[PDB]
C-alpha cells in the first residue's frame, strides 16, 4: 500500500467549482469551449498500477486520460487542445501537476481535505478551486 493509494485512488465526482471560467480564460480557452466545459460535471478516476498512475476525467463534454510516472515529464494534449509538457510529483501528500507551453506555466494540485478531494488550478494569480467527493 501507499499514501498515494490511500489518499487518491478511486472514483470522484465534482460537487462544486469556483473561478473556473476565469482560470480557463487565463489559460486561453475560447468562449464556446469555456461555456460547455464549465457546465460539465466530471468524474475523476485515479488508479495506480505499479509505478504508473492513471487519471481520467469523464463528462458529457469530453473524456480524457493521462498515465505517467511521478517525476517523469510527458507530452499531454489538454482538454482545451493545448500541447503541453507535463510533470506530476507528490509534494508532501499533494499531487502537483505542472504544465509548460509557449513560455507559460500552470499548476494543478490535488489534495485531500476531510472526505473531499480538492483540485486547485493556478495560472498567473488566478486560482480555481474544484471540490470532488467519492462517487
Ligand atoms: O479536472 C479538473 O477539475 C481540473 C481542471 C480542469 O478541469 N481543466 C480543464 C478542463 C476542461 C477544459 Br476545456 C479546460 C481545462 Cl483547463
Ligand atoms: Cl489542492
UniProtKB/Swiss-Prot annotation:
Q: Which Pfam families match?
A: Lipocalin
Phosphoserine is carried by which residues?
Answer: 16
Q: Kindly list the positions at which N-acetylcysteine occurs in this protein.
A: 5
Matching CDD domains, A to Z?
A: FABP4 (cd19467)
Tell me which Gene Ontology terms the entry assigns under biological process: brown fat cell differentiation; cellular response to lithium ion; cellular response to tumor necrosis factor; cholesterol homeostasis; fatty acid transport; long-chain fatty acid transport; negative regulation of DNA-templated transcription; positive regulation of cold-induced thermogenesis
Superkingdom, natural source: Eukaryota
What does the similarity note say? Belongs to the calycin superfamily. Fatty-acid binding protein (FABP) family.
Name this polypeptide is given: Fatty acid-binding protein, adipocyte
Origin organism of this chain? Homo sapiens
Gene, per the UniProt record: FABP4
Amino acid at each position: 500500500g501507499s499514501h498515494m493509494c490511500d489518499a487518491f485512488v478511486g472514483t470522484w465526482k465534482l460537487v462544486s467549482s469556483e473561478n473556473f471560467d476565469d482560470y480557463m480564460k487565463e489559460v486561453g480557452v475560447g468562449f464556446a469551449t469555456r461555456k460547455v466545459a464549465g457546465m460539465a460535471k466530471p468524474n475523476m478516476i485515479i488508479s495506480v498500477n505499479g509505478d504508473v498512475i492513471t487519471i481520467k476525467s469523464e463528462s458529457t463534454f469530453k473524456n480524457t486520460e493521462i498515465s505517467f510516472i511521478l517525476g517523469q515529464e510527458f507530452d499531454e494534449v489538454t482538454a482545451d487542445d493545448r500541447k503541453v509538457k507535463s510533470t506530476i510529483t507528490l509534494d508532501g501528500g499533494v499531487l502537483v501537476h505542472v504544465q509548460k507551453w509557449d513560455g507559460k506555466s500552470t499548476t494543478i494540485k490535488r489534495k485531500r481535505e476531510d472526505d473531499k478531494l480538492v483540485v486547485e488550478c493556478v495560472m498567473k494569480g488566478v486560482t480555481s478551486t474544484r471540490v470532488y467527493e467519492r462517487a
